Write a protein that binds this DNA or RNA. Structure first.
Ligand SMILES: [Mg+2]
Lengths: 142, 88, 200, 84, 129
RNA sequence: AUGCUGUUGCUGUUAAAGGGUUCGUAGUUGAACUGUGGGCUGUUCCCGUCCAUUCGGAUGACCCUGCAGCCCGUGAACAGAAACAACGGGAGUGG
RNA sequence: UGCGACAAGUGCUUUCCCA
RNA sequence: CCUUACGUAUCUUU
């Protein structure tokens, strides 16, 4: 996390050059869309759908099997989240810090880290309002 | 045909200097670490001929430690020194 | 009006060529005589088949254009089509490439944004190359800009599929220049993860 | 020695050591494997770095355990790595 | 963050050439940085170079032949009229005999000598000598 | 004169000078990609079959940018498709 | 509306259900 | 003429 803090950490997933399903999997592109849209009806957000297909079904990179991405499959089906997944987990983090700070009035470090997550919230929500993924009146809680 | 000319085609400069065979670096007159090494061309019976292969190396390249890597890279290119064993 | 002519576009059913008839007869034959082709061939039909003579001969390539609607249709069933067409056609090497339109790159900066990126000449030409060698996907790609001002694109393939496609590469590299008017040269990579070139 | 490094075509010894993004063309480290359940015996496809705990769809059991790197398969299960 | 990719590329070429290397690895690349290198090939300051395809921005491996002293990038890309070539030659070039100022013009990316002959002007990209 | 006002073109560890640390608006700066084509004609060694036993021998390499015509990706034609981007109150009395 | 030709950058002689 | 790849011990262990 480079934007807030001094971390220069470089740990990512390195996608393959050879963008092709490995020919030992016989699952249809039609069925992967059914499995992706099913997991969203069990409440899974798009980052969690892809790991469950990566780990157990052998579908690394849903984009390569079905030509479109996971969140695009969800937006077509009507199963997109109301606010984006990035903004969800930052708001859900920021409310868990504040419920901590109401009983722990002098947690000096978590009051600093709460400034940083809300700075990320107001900086993402400016992106999503500009790109029209979010309504213009949106305006984070606190 | 090396060195600057006149527009009358007479070679104007004195002293076209040497160049390093590793780094193409023009060897200056005060570069007192710059050496020439003459390697004997040898015949089919393993006795030297009257001809030698001379390669000249700049002084900073010897200063760092990188001359010995450069003499290898030259003599493989000239065909003087073999790069690996033959197959057993 | 003969029944093999369903395996052909309607503009050519009236006056087919000698090659357009020969492919469509063989492509109509492959229902009742083949297993996996029964599921996919009743929908399929070819636009035109164009024959090109390679300068180093003894196998003359036979290039069969089909509508790009049937792209995933053929990919499911390719290497059964090219094997069975080249079996019914002796001494011909059969390519099945889709017919793709290219949008010329707009001068306007606003039209350039609206361009469908599939109709891009860079995107079309890399799909045409994938059609010529379908089971062997493109492992790597390099451009060597040698000193005389020329670029040569080198495409690397997986060395595991050398025996399946070694005779075809001299043909593929020529027909890719017939269709795209670009020059390609091929090589192979053993262990393509670590970018190791085959070296004979 | 006597062979110089070529940056376009690096040695297999040099290139196998590198980080996956510090390669000349970056690529995965992971892979898929075909894991047979210890009872129940039915094959499953398990990712090598599966942070979730994959379940046997037939057996109902969990035949994987996440770690900091590669996930650990259960005792008594058979597995062979899948290609590509 | 990286701002100018051409200024990055010319700085890694010039650094590795004063160290006397045989090859550089340039990352990332562009259409601009290969059109700069092909100016440097035509007047023989570099050798053959090779663009490796990621599905990312590429990488370029450039073979050096000892002839380049310094290549650099002028940032920002100042606009240069046809009357302004003799001003830019006296500022960044060591002599009027050798050395080139590369410009991006309407006709393409060219050096200063070609652009003077075709009577064009452009924005200055960089130099090599 | 004075690169002692520095855009060209200055300094900032110790000489004057980095502001205690983060967030942060105005501001300035900002990653790669959609492409510049093609055709013809000019311009002696070494590798084995006989000898010898911790050191020998007779016996397959290499050598000979310039002008024109392009449906100017490929389809599809042999004007049709592809790609393209009506006023006399008019004209030295309706060229 | 019926009807005669030809296309289609995504196979409707499909895809789901269901027997 | 810039290699198509390679070497594994110690001691504590209901
Ligand atoms: Mg008129």
């Amino acid at each position: 996390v480079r934007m807030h803090g001094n971390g220069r950490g470089k740990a990512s997933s390195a996608l393959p050059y050879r963008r092709t399903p490995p020919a030992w999997l016989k699952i249809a592109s039609r069925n992967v869309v059914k499995m992706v849209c099913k997991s969203s009806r069990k409440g899974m957000m798009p980052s969690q759908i892809g790991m469950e297909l990566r780990d157990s079904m052998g579908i690394a990179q849903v984009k390569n099997v079905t030509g479109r991405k996971i969140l695009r499959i969800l937006k077509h089906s009507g199963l997109a989240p109301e606010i984006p997944e990035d903004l969800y987990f930052l708001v859900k983090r920021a409310t868990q810090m504040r419920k901590h700070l109401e009983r722990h009035t002098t947690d000096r470090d978590t009051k600093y880290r709460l400034i940083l997550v809300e700075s990320r919230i107001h900086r993402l929500a400016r992106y999503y309002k500009r790109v029209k993924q979010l309504p213009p009146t949106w305006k984070y809680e606190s | 045909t090396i060195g600057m000319f006149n527009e009358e085609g007479e070679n104007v400069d004195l002293y076209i200097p040497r160049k390093c065979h590793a780094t193409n670096t023009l060897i200056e007159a005060h570069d007192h670490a710059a050496v020439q090494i003459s390697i004997a061309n040898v015949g089919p019976n393993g006795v030297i001929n009257g001809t030698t292969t001379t390669l000249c190396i700049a002084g900073y390249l010897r200063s760092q430690g990188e001359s010995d890597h450069a003499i290898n890279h030259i003599t493989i290119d000239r065909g003087i020194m073999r790069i690996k064993t033959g197959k057993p | 009006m003969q029944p093999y002519l369903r395996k052909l576009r309607k503009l050519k059913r009236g006056k087919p060529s000698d090659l357009e008839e020969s492919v469509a007869k063989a492509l109509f034959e492959l229902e009742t005589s083949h297993k996996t082709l029964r599921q996919e061939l009743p929908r399929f039909h070819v636009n035109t088949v164009r024959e090109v003579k390679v300068p180093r001969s003894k196998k003359t390539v036979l290039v069969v254009f089909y509508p790009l609607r049937f792209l995933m249709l053929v990919r499911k069933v390719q290497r059964a089509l090219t094997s069975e067409l080249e079996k019914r056609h002796p001494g011909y090497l059969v390519m099945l490439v889709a017919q793709r339109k290219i949008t010329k790159r707009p001068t306007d900066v606003y039209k350039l944004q609206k361009v469908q990126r599939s109709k891009t000449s860079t995107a079309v030409f890399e799909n045409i190359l994938n059609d010529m060698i379908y089971p062997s996907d493109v492992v790597g790609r390099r451009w060597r800009c040698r000193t005389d001002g020329s670029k040569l694109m080198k495409v690397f393939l997986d060395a595991r599929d050398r025996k399946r496609v070694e005779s075809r590469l001299r043909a593929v590299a020529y027909v890719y220049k017939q269709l795209t008017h670009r020059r390609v040269s091929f090589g192979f990579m053993w262990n393509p993860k670590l970018q190791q070139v085959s070296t004979r | 020695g006597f062979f110089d490094a070529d940056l376009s075509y690096p040695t297999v010894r040099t290139e196998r050591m590198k980080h996956k993004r510090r390669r000349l063309v970056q690529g995965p480290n992971s892979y898929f494997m075909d894991v047979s359940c210890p009872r129940c015996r039915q094959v499953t496809v398990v990712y090598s770095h599966a942070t979730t705990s994959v379940e046997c769809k037939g057996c109902s059991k969990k035949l994987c355990r996440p770690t900091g790197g590669k996930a650990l398969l259960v005792e008594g299960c058979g597995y062979r790595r899948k290609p590509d | 963050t990286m701002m100018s990719v051409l200024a990055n590329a010319l700085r890694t070429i010039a650094s590795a050439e004063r160290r006397g290397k045989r090859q550089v690895l340039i990352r990332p690349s562009s259409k601009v940085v290969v059109k700069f290198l092909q100016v440097m090939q035509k007047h023989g300051y570099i050798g053959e170079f090779e663009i490796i395809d990621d599905h990312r921005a590429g990488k370029i491996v450039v073979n050096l032949n000892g002839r380049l002293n310094k290549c650099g990038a002028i940032c920002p890309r100042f606009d240069c009229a046809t009357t302004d070539y003799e001003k830019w030659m006296k500022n960044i070039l060591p002599s009027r005999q050798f050395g080139f100022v590369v410009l991006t013009t309407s006709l393409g990316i060219m050096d200063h000598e070609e652009a003077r002959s075709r009577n064009t002007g452009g924005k200055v990209l960089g130099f090599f000598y």
